[PDB]
Swiss-Prot record:
The chain holds residues 2054 to 2166 of 2168 of the full protein. Expressed at varying levels in several tissues, whereas a smaller transcript was expressed specifically in testis. It comes from the Eukaryota. It comes from Homo sapiens (Human). This is Bromodomain adjacent to zinc finger domain protein 2B. It is found in: Nucleus. The gene is BAZ2B.
Length: 115
């Protein structure tokens, strides 16, 4: 509350560390569904169904231009990628499996780096 603060957690390396995680996600062999924004002209249903599209290139540009206020807003966008993928793709599809794999990979790096 006013003039009553918990001890200051060091957040000075968060930007660098999120960038490192994102690099690892970009280079994963199952990243291909997620590297670029879904083409809303060429994929029926996507525009109407997926209210907030997100992809790794969009996260990378937000990250690089100071559009994440803190590491939690970064994780929310990464999770959005996978949540969108589950909304639009069957679990038993190459893309649906890719998204599960990537979400697992992310969540481990996230816990190991920050928790």
């Amino acid at each position: 509350s006013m003039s009553v603060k918990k001890p200051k957690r060091d957040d000075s390396k968060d930007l660098a560390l999120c960038s490192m995680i994102l690099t690892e996600m970009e280079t994963h062999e199952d990243a291909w569904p997620f590297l670029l924004p879904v083409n809303l002209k060429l994929v029926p249903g996507y525009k109407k169904v997926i209210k907030k599209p997100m992809d790794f290139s969009t996260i990378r540009e937000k990250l690089s231009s100071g559009q994440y206020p803190n590491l939690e807003t970064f994780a929310l966008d990464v999770r959005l990628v996978f949540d969108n993928c589950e909304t639009f793709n069957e679990d038993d599809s190459d893309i649906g499996r890719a998204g599960h794999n990537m979400r697992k990979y992310f969540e481990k790096k996230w816990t190991d780096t920050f928790k």
